[PDB]
Amino acid sequence: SKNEWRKSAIANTLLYLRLKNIYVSADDFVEEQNVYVLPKNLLKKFIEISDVKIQVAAFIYGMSAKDHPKVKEIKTVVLVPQLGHVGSVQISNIPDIGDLPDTEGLELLGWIHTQTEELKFMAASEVATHSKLFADKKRDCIDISIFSTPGSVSLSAYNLTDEGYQWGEENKDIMNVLSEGFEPTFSTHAQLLLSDRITGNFIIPSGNVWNYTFMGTAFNQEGDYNFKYGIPLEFYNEMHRPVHFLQF
């Protein structure tokens, strides 16, 4: 049937319950390298607006404190026009947010996204997309991968090596079967800390819609889009589905 989504849409209502089980990938703390702090409220919301099956992604912007130049607090999650799939997501370009208020000296720290396959390393659609977005622009951009599954969510932060990037540049496209040249060693654990003592916020497209699944013709993947602070829409929000209200 067409209505695969109906079942998923009902599912996403209980997606808030997955946040009684929040797991963060940890290893030995190294003060020689960075630590990324993700405000807990942003996580809670970002999951609440995600799908159970289809990938959902955003950029993260943040900045260092004075106390430690290596503690990068994430301040803002910028949700942008995009077209999700199972196991991959097509994302529009790094947003221009320069002209918004309170954006004084934010760094683009990277991206954050859902997935339905728990791994210990960045996968091949991840590496393709990570290179697509950041290859020629900002190499240190991390990837925060969220493994979201019934019961729980599990966060995992990665850097990408230059071999990773190069390999990703080689792959303009990714197929289900080809799986050519891939390495789990392409990516490296990055230090992520979830904190509840700082609260971050969202920046959303000005049109308000971030989910161009049911509008896949109008999705401009190099679109010059506008943005504002604001509360992000849910994945199957009526506005992401003009078409279903036409049948009715």
């Binding site: 209502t13 916020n201 504002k228 602070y229 509360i231 009715f248």
Partner: protein, 860 residues
């Protein structure tokens, strides 16, 4: 347990194989100590009020009551036989009430000082009295209006009117409204028709109505005149007490006094099994129908269901042809047939037509409005010999026949989940059709039932007991909400003006009193009921209660329950449950008490299924379930679906007139409770129910052509986009029509979208003041906007889930175009006090106009 019914002298029983019939002769003339009061003896204005009654004088009952009615101002209770002439009796009391205001010397008649209310049990009859009273009281230039069937704010106006004809419930809601207290003061005549409804499970409405007129008046001090109109039944004594009628004004008329005097007959079917019992009644029915026809008389058959009418009518049709069929076709083949068969063809659609060709009609709701009006009018005109009816005819219409047969008295109570016997008031309503008073020398009423029941219906042609406990919790809350209860002594006083109370004192064993002799006038019992009631209310957060202290307090949630007439239990569910979703709302909507009785009847079910599978919002519920009907109906109203069945089309109408203020009550709760997403969705449903759409509002101007909107709806250009253009040529270019482009623009120009700016000022740490400046400029409307367009203003949290302040703005033609300012304070929660959020939101939504919402961020 046996309570054998005394039958008048001359009564007798015949035993027939299929049914025991038992006979009650027409009664002898009474002692003639009266003169029929010819109209001409009435003062000369009135006389108009009685134009061309065939008699040109009042009938016996009316003449005897005329002194006290028209020359008296005393309260009155009139118990009389069925079909005794209630209108003119009501009329006499009306005219008297008018007399107290107009000057005898002055030509001029005061119209603002007096309000007359006429309570009547069913809309069918309420409408009828409105038509009749308008015609008759036309000459005095007074307005008679049905007190509005659906809405609430538009009641404040209907005091354009001098005679209000309501049902008990509509007048209960009206008069229970704190704001209507203004207008209850002008009500001088309160006519309650069918006052013996007191005994029905609807009767407490009449108790509440009266308890309120006497007891709650207080400082305003002048009680209206009351005239009860009743069936002759035991306890009329107690009833006249209940509505403070003194002996001057109490009347009881024996069957001797009944105009169009009624003959009764009771076929007591005796067959045990269903197949043969059903046959027994059909035969039994056929005989009586035949007899009535052989005497040149017409006849109305009451049956329990709508499918029954058509199958009973058919049995007859065929059984009449099985032997003769000449008898009912026509009065004369030459006279009738061309006049019948012309009319038989024209509006008749269903199997009804093959029946009408045979001179027998069917009549039920869920039948084409034109189709049932033919039935009434053909039967009225002699052309149909036999109308087969569902019970509604009895309350709705004024369509008499010489003979009326109740086939069967089995009825289905959905409330009781079970089959049951006809209530007494239904049987008495039905029998009020029997006997055409102007034409017929007399009338005939035939009940057909199981022998078990015959004794019972004999007695009827009944007891009355209070059900006030069952609805006690809901009804207590409403007085708590009206602020008349703060401590539980107010509650045990209140209960003293109930029927329950008068009835408990008098049969304490029935009502399970502990000990009347200890309790005296049941003071501890009252207090105990009140307690238990209050605790279950407190348990559910409709009230605040301290037993020890003894303070009763009114919650916002209880305040919704009272105002929207919602069951306390239902308020509980709404409390806990409100992740509520669109699909759920439609369900919850459909769960409303207001729609308790909605049932999916067999015939309409096929059509209903067609709509339930094209439904835009999923329905979890079955097509068996009533909830699915209400849901699919409401979805239809939003899509303005064309309906064939009359039954169902009435149903749907009933839904939209409530949908509005129910959906609002739902919205109000969610806004109070903070739930962003259902609050947002409810606001739309509310819009959707105003605008009758899920559509550019060029369709909302009655004065637009049908083609022009269709091109703009498909063209996907934003609605507001068309509004921006300030040039009359430009608007016409977008339409792609020249002449429609100049006419459209003036309408287009008038519509406007607010402008809002808002800064914030911290007064203290905790307290933020918000200063707002607003403008919209729109073309004035004498047709499109009314006197005002109201606008909800909310300030809500960043998530858009928590309403922090609200206020309603009413824009008026003097307000549009010019700027104004609003200020308010809101106290930041501790969370936000420590870390300010980035922004809040401030939003304005038209209560009336789709997609006129305008929201702006309010930065920290």
């Amino acid at each position: 347990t046996v309570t054998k019914v005394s039958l008048p002298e001359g009564s007798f029983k015949r035993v027939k194989p299929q049914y025991d019939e038992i006979h009650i002769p027409a009664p002898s003339k009474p002692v003639i100590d009266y003169e029929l009061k010819e109209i001409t003896s009435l003062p000369d204005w009135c006389q108009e009020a009685f134009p061309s009654s065939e008699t040109t004088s009042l009938n016996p009952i009316q003449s005897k009551v005329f002194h006290a009615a028209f020359e008296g101002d005393s309260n009155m209770l009139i118990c009389a036989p069925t079909g005794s002439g209630k209108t003119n009796i009501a009329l006499l009391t009306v005219l008297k009430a008018l007399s107290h205001h107009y000057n005898p010397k002055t030509k001029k008649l005061n119209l603002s000082a007096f309000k007359i209310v006429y309570i009547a049990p069913l809309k069918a009859l309420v409408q009828e009295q409105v038509r009749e009273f308008q015609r008759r009281l036309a000459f005095l230039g007074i307005k008679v209006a049905e007190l509005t069937g659906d809405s609430r704010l538009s009641r404040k106006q209907i005091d354009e009117t001098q005679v209000l004809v309501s049902t008990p419930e509509k007048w209960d809601i009206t008069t229970r409204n704190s704001n209507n207290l203004a207008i209850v003061e002008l009500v001088r005549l309160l006519i309650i028709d069918e006052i013996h409804l007191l005994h029905d499970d609807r009767g407490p409405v009449l108790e509440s109505i009266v308890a309120r007129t006497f007891w709650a008046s207080k400082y305003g001090q002048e009680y209206p005149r009351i005239i009860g109109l009743s069936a002759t039944l035991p306890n009329y004594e107690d009833v006249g007490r209940f509505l403070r009628v003194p002996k001057e004004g109490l009347f009881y008329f024996d069957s001797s006094f009944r105009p169009c005097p009624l003959s009764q007959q009771f076929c007591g079917i005796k067959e045990r099994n269903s197949l043969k019992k059903l046959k027994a009644m059909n035969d039994a029915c056929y005989e009586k129908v035949l007899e009535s026809i052989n005497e040149g008389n017409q006849i109305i058959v009451f049956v329990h269901s709508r499918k029954e009418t058509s199958r009973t009518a058919t049995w007859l049709k065929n059984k009449f042809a099985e032997e003769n069929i000449t008898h009912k076709l026509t009065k004369n083949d030459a006279g009738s047939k061309q006049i019948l068969k012309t009319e038989a063809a024209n509006v008749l659609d269903p199997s009804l037509r093959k029946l009408i060709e045979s001179g027998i009609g069917t009549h039920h709701a869920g039948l084409t409005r034109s189709d049932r009006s033919l039935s009434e009018d053909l039967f009225a005109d002699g052309l149909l010999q036999v109308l087969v009816c569902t019970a509604t005819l009895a309350w709705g219409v004024n369509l008499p026949a010489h003979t009326v047969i109740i086939k069967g008295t089995d009825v289905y109570s959905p409330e009781k989940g079970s089959w049951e016997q006809l209530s007494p008031q239904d049987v008495l309503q039905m029998l009020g059709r029997a006997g055409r008073p102007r034409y017929d020398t007399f009338g005939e009423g035939i009940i057909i039932t199981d022998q078990s029941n015959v004794q019972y219906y004999l007695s009827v042609l009944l007891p009355i007991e209070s059900q006030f406990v069952s609805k006690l919790v809901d009804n207590l809350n409403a007085e708590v909400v009206a602020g008349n209860i703060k401590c539980r002594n107010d509650a045990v006083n209140w209960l003293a003006y109930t029927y329950l109370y008068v009835r408990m004192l008098a049969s304490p064993m029935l009502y399970k009193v502990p000990d009347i002799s200890s309790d005296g006038q049941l003071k501890k019992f009252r207090e105990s009921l009140v307690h238990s009631a209050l605790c279950i209310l407190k348990e559910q957060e409709l009230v605040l209660y301290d037993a020890e202290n003894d303070v009763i307090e009114a919650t916002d949630l209880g305040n919704i329950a009272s105002s929207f007439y919602i069951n306390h239990a239902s308020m509980d569910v709404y409390n806990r449950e409100l992740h509520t979703t669109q699909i759920d709302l439609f369900r919850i909507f459909s769960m409303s008490e207001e729609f308790k009785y909605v049932s999916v009847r067999y015939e309409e079910k096929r059509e209903l299924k067609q709509l339930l599978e094209k439904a835009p919002i999923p329905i979890r519920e079955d097509i068996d379930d009533p909830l699915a009907k209400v849901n699919v109906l409401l979805q239809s109203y939003f899509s303005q679906l064309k309906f064939e069945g009359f039954a169902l089309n009435s149903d749907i109408v009933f839904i939209h007139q409530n949908a509005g203020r129910l959906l609002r009550a739902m919205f109000e709760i969610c806004l109070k409770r903070g739930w962003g997403h259902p609050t947002r969705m409810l606001l739309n449903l509310c819009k959707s129910a105003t605008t009758k759409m899920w559509n550019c509002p060029l369709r909302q101007f009655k004065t637009c052509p049908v083609e022009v909107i269709k091109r703009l709806e498909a063209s996907t250009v934003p609605w507001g986009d068309y509004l921006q253009l300030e040039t009359p040529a430009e608007v016409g270019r977008a339409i792609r029509s020249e002449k429609y482009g100049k006419q459209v623009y003036d309408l287009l120009k008038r519509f406007p979208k607010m402008s809002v700016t808002c800064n914030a000022q911290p007064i203290t740490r905790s307290v933020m003041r918000f200063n707002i400046e607003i403008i919209a400029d729109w073309i004035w409307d004498m047709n499109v906007h009314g006197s005002l367009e109201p606008f909800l203003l909310m300030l809500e949290d960043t998530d858009g889930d928590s309403i922090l302040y609200y206020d309603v703005l009413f824009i008026t033609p003097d307000i549009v175009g010019h700027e104004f300012t609003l200020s308010f304070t809101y106290e930041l929660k501790q969370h936000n006090q420590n870390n300010l959020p980035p922004n809040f939101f401030l939003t304005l939504i038209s209560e009336n106009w789709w997609h006129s919402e305008f929201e702006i961020p309010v930065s920290f």
